[model samples]
Target chain A: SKKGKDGRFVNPWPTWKNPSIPNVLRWLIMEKDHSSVPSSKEELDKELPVLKPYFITNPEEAGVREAGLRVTWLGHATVMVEMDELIFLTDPIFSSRASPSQYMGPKRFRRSPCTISELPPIDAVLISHNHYDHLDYNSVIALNERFGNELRWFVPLGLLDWMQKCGCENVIELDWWEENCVPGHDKVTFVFTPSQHWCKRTLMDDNKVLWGSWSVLGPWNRFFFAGDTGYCPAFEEIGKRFGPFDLAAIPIGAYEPRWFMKYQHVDPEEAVRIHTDVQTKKSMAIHWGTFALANEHYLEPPVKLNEALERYGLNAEDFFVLKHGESRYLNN
Target chain B: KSKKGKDGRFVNPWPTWKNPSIPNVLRWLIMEKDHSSVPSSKEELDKELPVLKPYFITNPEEAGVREAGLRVTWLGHATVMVEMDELIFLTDPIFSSRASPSQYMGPKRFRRSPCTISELPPIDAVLISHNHYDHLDYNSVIALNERFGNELRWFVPLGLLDWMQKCGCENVIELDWWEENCVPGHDKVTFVFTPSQHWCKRTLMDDNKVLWGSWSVLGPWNRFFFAGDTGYCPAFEEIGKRFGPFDLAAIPIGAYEPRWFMKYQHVDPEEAVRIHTDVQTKKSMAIHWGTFALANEHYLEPPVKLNEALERYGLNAEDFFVLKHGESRYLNND
Candidate 1:
């Protein structure tokens, strides 16, 4: 059978790296002599003040499995998806650094909202691409072993071999616009959609594998996950075809200085636009308010998103910006 | 180093006297800014510091489990623990009443560390970024040295050896920027002392005598950078080039306001992004925020402002992240 009723199946083009790319050596010069605008010694003496630490007791947690529309954000992009009673997780980097080892990398400033071992049994894990931050090998292996035979992973076409090497036995690989269902769970289908993004893990594998978004439809809810993408007409096309998503999770951080990163990352404003393009009934802002990835103030994304939501005349609640570990119940 | 003509101690730079009553004066500033409403009874502070159930990874054999990596809990102010690869590293491990000589004075931590020093894991390495009281507490260091002695390797900035030795540490390794030391079997952990536009002082006599900068840990397989305490500067770009594409970067994101006053010591959120870009790392998680109200910005303003900044740059929250206290994540390289 053809993928997606519209027969929009298009073979993904062969991936290639741009040979002329610069060595990125400009990042090496350690300029220690450049002085900062000094704070006066007299002023420095005015010691930093202290405040009481705050914690949330009775933090709420919930999961949806029966309605075939389960979603859980394990803080940041690590999300669990259950549709037609088939479970899947996205970009599971449960580690602190997004690193190869734990001795060093960016140590988490705060603890994880929840640990991976505490998660419900997972069925299929999906890796959007291979950034140290996204396709965490260790987290994937842990989940694989944790779920054992009950677990199968769905990944991009070129990634299955890598998954098997990493100890994952069952994997379904697809190119862009490809669709598949679990052997018995034919009611739910997953379609790989196009996203304007690139991929690389090591210095050698830049764009060797593909990166894109996903659309999943079950009896109750249809959803879209923008793994990581920039602004483009592709979003509008996705909206026109498989969208009007019941829920959409879109990234909104790490874009600083439009001239440098615009093609790669989408800021809050563009994220809002993508939300509209995907035609999501309700949206949640992800990727911001978590890490200091780009050149903006710490709290800028949500403030700007609130303004953008107002400008577009959308309810702030519809575009939910969850605090870490926060959840919402969709009664559809 | 010379005695004065009248046989008085002649310090190299003569001390200057100023009006201590002025609101802007250092002493008055501390009293005015840091002193909060202490509960009428000790019951309040005691109630506030209670320990609760914390998350730990007991099943270490799970596959993605190691990818989840280590857990580092911030114990208020400059004190933190690095739990990963089955090892624990401590940074400026202070857990005392004041980051000053007098227990009754100086910058008292408003929020207590999540856990007290005694509540922490037996530290394997005590990292001292500098000699500043905020970064290197004498009593806390001495206590840790006594407790984790021989078991702990005290890593300090260059020129801090004398002070650390005097403070009773025997296994101290003072390193300059870009210097690497072998931690036995693990790959070398390099300490690159990148410049910060700030000065250091403990007593009335010591100022700018000790160096201050950030440290970058280059593991056998991964890279991490700790921007100890610094203002926004172009040097971060240099640091990034020397150590480009860090798996993660721990950059400070607080204690900035009255721009004129803090411009030299700490960086604001906007500058933090600039630092991230300059450092050329893939992801950054914010620190120095939500722990203490060190500046005039509202308690939650740092994250809010940081989000706004990211929006302006067309970035999403996933690119750079900030986590809640006591939370942890395991990273993988699949």
Candidate 2:
């Protein structure tokens, strides 16, 4: 929304702050174990339990009822959403680790529910931003290799060159609040919504690309994906503009050490705040349980989300979390 | 090059910071001030600002505007419709009753626009200098788009593409300072966004989120420069060196007063004359005045000051002239 004199993009909100050197050092080297995540492997195993993922491999036979919407959480921030028989993928990350190298960095503690080949024919893919976890090189390569140009990719501005370089030619780039309809499918219009976040793939290219949310409107349903963001006034504006969404996928993880990550990542309570802000009839919790990206316990996000739902006098059924590979159909 | 501040906001590359402190603003607003130069009443304002009948060229090819190589029509308040190399370009098209977010308030226009958006000839492209209400009007943009649709290309500074697209202008291009682009199928005509000593703020939180700059439209046979809005700065000389010898330039000559606050953003007539020389323009016309009472300057002081500046600089008054609100001037290609 703003740019440095260097022409690098910056989050326009006042809440955004680049991490300071002292704060980074204090979080990395000086800080001791004070999070809910246990230090010992045995204690961690007791706190975070392994659950088998469920997949709707064949939605044609999965006898759906009320709504034409079906959302399958793949893993982490990735989800496969089907509306009006058109499948759309959100931040497809099938890699084992969210990093430049699969050998190191933040590795996934659980396996992905399915590979790229197992999913149904995807009409389009929505990329929120260029984070390693969201815009995975391998995932882009795999999807490009599998679907080729048939799978239309929608990305924020400044990521088009990267997408084209990734061998995906059918990419449409948009700025905040800019909308474009799917080619040959005018009913599905994608609105590039705003988010309070920063982007960095290289050390020098921090905020070089925009980071934002996505709003997909079909003939019968409206879907929203909160790519990755912290609490900001954009949500309220989004609600006012493209609100009353039928379903929304909001981030509820990787928010620990509030002083360090508060500006970039939303905690579970703030996640519920976003759910309310966007006026979603149904919301699915994402961005947690698959990786130990933050200091919080792996299972703490859902627990906190439920606690927040009760505190706000809201129904857990309205804003719920799904296990990896589990499919949930919504009522229109 | 753009100056990146530590706070992530872009700072003016030039040393033109006016430091608009709260005390300075209050001093101007609350303390006893002078509006003597301004109109004493609505009757005086109407009497001071003149709106002339514009000579409209309905068809450029038929009227010999294309053969003339350059024809510029002043539409008041920085809006000029220029025809060069068969391409029609409009700069900062604002046609509302007031230069504000709402028509009911803000700096109301004392003079009427020479022509409406519907009255203008087919425009090939538009060049927006910045996002100020006076320069970029929603109603004008929507009307232009409704009239010309996507065939009309829009060129704006960075961070303004979203706003333009939001205004339903699909064919919009955004460029940073020094970046140049040619309209599709018209590669011979190049438009460059040049630096200006100004800031942008359409909303409270969006200070400098967008950019502010002047524009250089270079055709195969002629070069036209539009000084969107700016104060005196060294960038004009740099612009001169890079894209100098402009055949015709539309420069600002008003909205400059209280030298301390306006000097860093709005150039007085003297500095406007300096810009004409600095940019190496063969002929320049005065703009950005005689429409709204944006500053404390006398309503008719700009032309008088401009004449005095031309005399002081020993330059021909015809070289840097002021036009009637709707006057048209043709520049000789030679």
Candidate 3:
């Protein structure tokens, strides 16, 4: 573990909190300050990506609930991944806005693929960090209410209390390089890997919460969730440890006005680099369509994503983006 | 009991579809729609606003919350201190300055609770009606847990158990409407969760995710009825038919302004009286107002209207009344 002079745990790369640069906070504040916010109309007026209303429900929606290699896109930064008898979910935001409220801030145009009540009893709910969009309180609260102590929670540190506070107890805290086996579930291990990203819900906690990537490694299908990280070499380390993942859910949007977002969110190009660096066998492009979270046009990610795949000498089919409620199998 | 559908969605039968159009729902919640206001909504973030202060104070102390006999004390708002046959029950206790997620904003309490938690006798149980910040104060409940340890039981609606477990309270039970539990040591006496037509949300997104209901406390002497926040509904008649001839009742009597917005959630003074008759209680006392200005009504409106309704119904102040914040009423003295 890296430590600073004050004896607090530190990450490898310098964080945005470096007071050494005077304009750093200014830039961070300015980018978040949101000089230009496009309305839903403005985002829709553009040459939008085709938001296929169909789920592709790959191989028909039939026993996908029971297990086997299946994945469903539940809109921005959220997915349900099932492999054989083990099922896990990633960073859930079932509400309308990325902001705390429904009225203002970045809102979702597309509805979630399914509601909380519609989902099967999840085995694990993996939280990458405490961002409103990723570690959504409402979604977790509903899960806790519905599942109670039945479901296990896999979260980064500093969020154990947050999860525990909402009335859930079966939780495992993970630090970078830490791995926890889903107890009682045979051969299922969740490994925590490093990421070039920060986490916070309140202002005082910009870098306070741990942000990392996750690997849901079962015997049959190994899945990875980038959980919103920028380009970093740690992804290479992840591949070394938990590589050949059957599928990876990677972010490919919210990188416009890159001065601030670049170090945190991966653009289409970096996402594919991550797809390569992590040895992700097959991957899904995510974190767009639902939310107008950043300055990018609504349809911008898939466009850049197709080009990014071509640029990286990869087929568009190899790394694909699903329609809002789509589901398909990952053949690795 | 809920089951998943072929579409993988879970089914919930909450018995009521109590949401207005989404547009109307947002205007009131402001937590989500206005974002600039309420619990970190845009307006609440890092803005220099005045510290909230309470308006009403009456000796500002907590007494036994009870006396030597069966007694009732109005601690403030929906929180009621009812000591019957030596068992202590505190309903919807909240001692926070504001009824919200953050101390910065939302509906500010108008008065300090008439008593402190220290003033109460080591109690038996606490009943939480729902998850609204005003009723389910985290700091207050945690303080109670620190003071009483595992001695006090918490009976909240179905969805709130996890919050208590994380808060370190050991004896917490989740109850759904019509579900009843034997009050542990009290033989024949039970805590039956009855219907209350209301919703719950600690944040903007989790609308009605938790269960909310009133209580039917079948005590040694009185089958006490305690209505948490509720609107006028026919369910009260069902309650009366099944568990009627109740000796006492505690009902909400304020915050029913602009009927369209409040009708489904709160009961006005007239409707409160109507509920007293429907529940067939010998006497009823009002709660949930006078401590906070959550609605547009004046401080005296609830009491003023209560008296009017009593006259209209040809009842006496002895039959139904409002208590001062810290006042206590002794019952079953014979």
Candidate 4:
């Protein structure tokens, strides 16, 4: 009732279970398996998060107004989805660092694919959660000034009033499964689907707002933009309700030290399971090769995902772990 | 476009109208123009024979909710469901029989509302004027929320947000008198809230808690002015200068009798015509009358007044035509 949601719990908030801090620390210090651990600066550089600035060449002429489906990996958790006549950017974070202060927090190991100012006209933005890496207030304010209420922002519950106070007034809050057929463009309908994710921007504000995935039901094709979510039944449910998506941007990186990360961040094996659960025609891997949010070794997510793809009988091209700044629109 | 808003932007409720200061309003109230003669309840129905349907059902598939032209469907008092430039908006819906908390009494409708809520096309949003019992009906708001789901945006004046709390109304935003909000998507509409000379109250205790005003819905291909409810004011000239060149305007042309007390809150027929001219609307719809007997004027007097004022001003009758309840008209700005 506090959230005014239907067929949900009567608790003051929507409740879900998560890993205990003790177990997480215990695995971190004790039983967690490690492919390698970082110590010295060179060793740290040698460990996880492999960096290649020009791993994939950036196309200066790539744009989103093309036909059918187009997915661009803008590094880390940022992916630009283009379909039909609409363009949607997901979990965009263009700040120098993903932190409360610009000077601190998880700093980006490399530059973003495109600067916020250099981007094309975006019709809407879909945010998954309130984690600093996924949501940057500075980026939000910049987007507001750039789009000037023309860019539609869809967030989870408890964020509408927050966004307005931050100097933007065109935000729509959605609970899980809450659908909004955009008023200006009726052909694009956004459905806020479920996700297994925890949210915390501050120590005191944990889980204050809801977090979830998005289903972009457009005239040309249906697509899924999965934020940082663990493997759960919600994927199968999402598949059943609104799946068989032409493309899915699934998180396939930054998950490691399985003892502590298994319950919260799904490894590439589980990402493969998720790829199956959601029934995506093709899955693009993300949330890695940018910031080191966890203790996992760099390049760990992709290494295991390659093996899992063969185990799951999926071809290499079926699920692409794109190089930073690379886009499928380059050749198309 | 110089001295517009921030960065040479177009500011709304643009600062050209002389908003009477509080002292001016109090002085006007204290002037105490002689207020007395209102026709009795016996003479309320001395207008015309009762009619069953004052409406024509609009087909949505053909129109597609504004299909490249301007169109309007006259639902009851102040409620005009209109579509223009590919977006649909319903203004001030009141479906209940009595505009009161009590079912047994209060201002009853002279004739039943022309249509029910189920018959409406897909409404993208509701542009509310204020929280008066007539403008903000409980049953109407809830029915719309349930039927339209999350696509419905409720744009209201300041302090009216709580009215939406009970009905699970999401996607609602409150706007200040001069504020403008761009609706989501190709709602390609910029709604700028302008001032109106009216006070509001559902009861004595809640008076003036919520704001009262009019709206100008502006777009590239079309523009509309909805005079929610107001008396005669010089603000019309300001509205005309700032947000005019309107394709159509829906003005309230009713309820002005016993002008000593009513003139500040309700515009007479002549003042309504003046508003039509001042606001620069190509054509107009005389609204806010006929549905409910809010004032002492005969149910038909407002339309009669419209005719007389247009004639006296050397204007054609067709310029500001009165729509029959339940009737819909299409306008193409040639």
The candidate maximizing lDDT is: 2
TM-score of chain A of each: 0.80, 0.86, 0.84, 0.84
Candidate 1's DockQ: 0.01
> Candidate 2's residue-wise lDDT over A1-332, tens digit each?
33211123244222233331222222223333536443343443465443333433343553323357888888888988877647788999976667774223565655577766556668789998887788888678768876877888999778899988878889998877788876767877888887877677775775667778898887788889998888877677777776689988999998887887777789989999999999999999889877666788777889899999998989889899986677787866
C-alpha lDDT score of every prediction, in listed order: 0.61, 0.76, 0.71, 0.72
Worst 10 residues of 4 chain A by lDDT: A19-28
Error of 2 at B172 (Å): 0.6
**Residues A19-47 of candidate 1: C-alpha lDDT, one tens digit per residue:** 21222221113221212222232332232
Q: Which stretches of candidate 3 lie above 4 Å from their native place?
A: A1-29, A32-68, A100-104, B1-334
Q: Go through the candidates in order and give the C-alpha RMSD of each one to the true structure.
A: 23.9, 23.0, 22.6, 21.1
Sort by lDDT, best first.
2, 4, 3, 1
| Native-to-model Cα distance after best TM-score fit, residue A286 in candidate 4, in Å | 63
Worst 10 residues of 2 chain B by lDDT: B21-30
How do the residues B182-284 of candidate 3 rate in per-residue lDDT, one tens digit apiece? Answer: 6567766788787777777776567676877788888656678888988887778778877877877898998887667777778899999999999998889
Stretches > 4 Å off in candidate 1: A1-70, A101-105, B1-334
TM-score: the better of candidates 1 and 2: 1
Q: After best superposition, candidate 2 residue B247: deviation in angstroms?
A: 0.7
Kindly provide the TM-score of model 3 when superposed on the true structure, using C-alpha atoms: 0.49
